[PDB]
Amino acid sequence: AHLRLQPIYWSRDDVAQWLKWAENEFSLRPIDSNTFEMNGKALLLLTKEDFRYRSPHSGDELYELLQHILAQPAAGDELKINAACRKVQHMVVKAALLADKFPVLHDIGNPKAIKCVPQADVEWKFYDAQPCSDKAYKIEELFYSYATHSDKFTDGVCLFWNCNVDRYPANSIVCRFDKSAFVNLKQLPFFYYSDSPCESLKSATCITRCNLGGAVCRHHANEYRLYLDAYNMMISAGFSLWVYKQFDTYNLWNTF
Ligand SMILES: Nc1ncnc2c1ncn2[C@@H]1O[C@H](CSCCCCNCc2cccc(-c3ccc(Cl)cc3)c2)[C@@H](O)[C@H]1O
Ligand SMILES: [K+]
Ligand SMILES: [Zn+2]
């Protein structure tokens, strides 16, 4: 299932599993798993000749295989994408509320009145153009247009998780499925934030207590890697994340 990502997201282990899969799918002479000691990003840099030299018995086959994979990327499993999207949503909105301590959250495009951070100290308010009739009693029926509402919802923060509107207001958190709509915002770079306790990896994007000293505990390490797999699955599927321009990860480091 890892291979259902674009090869540019493949790890060293993924490339090796790719070999094993192809050896059985195409009945190839078996190649050593370390025939391509590299990740998919490096794999996309090699020439077909490098394939022939690294595997004289099946290198050309594998190259054209990689090319057929790039020419027709595999469709994603909807349940794994829902879960990925839900995981990133909770991560990101939780961090923003902790960084900037917004008093109100305006959730625009949420027909089910479900909080993605139920434990947060904030007033949560829901809006949707077509609310679920079983949740409309606590949802404002509203079609957001920047032209009509740019003067409203100016307190706290607005959340547009896959609610594609004409233009997002400046105090927004946005997920968008595939640039004039995003002028008030900036791209959200990757980060992982956790305040769960440490229990017994190097990267500047693992915002955890154990990484203040650079010695991330085994637990947050595993949780970081799970979160990066979910994030990659979402980005690889065509989502992008946008945020209010004052978003600052150093505010999250200050929570420790
Ligand atoms: N202009 C609008 N103003 C207000 N509401 C407006 C406006 N346009 C549209 N809507 C409403 O948004 C909504 C249009 S997506 C309806 C699903 C809920 C969106 N978020 C909740 C959520 C949570 C987790 C995952 C996902 C998710 C991830 C990937 C993909 Cl592929 C699809 C969904 C979504 C409907 O409720 C529309 O009636
Ligand atoms: K606003
Ligand atoms: Zn830790």
* CATH code for position 33: 1.10.150.50
**How far, in Å, from the CA of 229 to the mean position of ligand 2?**
33
As beta bridge partners, residue 185 has: 244
Tell whether residue 149 is among the known ligand binding residues.
no
> From residue 220, how far is each of 80, 117, 129, 226, 253 by CA, in Å?
22, 20, 39, 10, 15
Q: Phi-psi bin for 232: left (phi > 0), alpha (psi -120 to 50), beta?
A: alpha
Cβ-defined contacts of 209-216 (< 8 Å, 24+): 209/256, 212/253, 212/256
Among candidate residues 36, 58, 76, the one with its CA nearest the CA of residue 235: 76
3-state class (DSSP) for residue 244: strand
Identify the nearest ligand to the CA of 126 by its number. 1
Among candidate residues 31, 25, 30, the one with its CA nearest the CA of residue 3: 25
Range of 47's domain? Answer: 2-71
Q: Is 203 exposed, middle or buried (0-12, 13-18, 19+ CB in 10 A)?
A: middle
In angstroms, the CA 146 to CA 166 distance is 6
**To test the ligand 1 pocket, which listed residue (153, 163, 166, 241) has its Cβ within 8 A of the most ligand atoms?**
163
Phi, psi of 111 (to 5 degrees): -85, -5
Q: Phi-psi bin for 136: left (phi > 0), alpha (psi -120 to 50), beta?
A: alpha
> From residue 43, how far is each of 7, 38, 52, 153 by CA, in Å?
8, 7, 13, 48
Residues 6 or more apart in contact with residue 43 via CB below 8 angstroms: 7, 10, 15, 36, 66
Other Cβ atoms within 10 Å of 134 Cβ, number: 9
3-state class (DSSP) for residue 253: helix
**How far, in Å, from the CA of 223 to the mean position of ligand 3?**
9
* Structure determination technique employed: X-ray
**How far, in Å, from the CA of 143 to the mean position of ligand 2?**
14
In angstroms, the CA 218 to CA 204 distance is 16
Resolution of the model in angstroms: 1.6
Strands (E), 8-129: 104-108, 123-128
By the 8 A CB rule, do 84 and 233 touch?
yes
Distance of CA 86 to the CA centre of its chain: 10
Identify the nearest ligand to the CA of 111 by its number. 1
In angstroms, the CA 205 to CA 140 distance is 37
By the 8 A CB rule, do 160 and 109 touch?
yes
**Amino acid, single-letter form, for residue 120:** A
Distance of CA 225 to the CA centre of its chain: 12
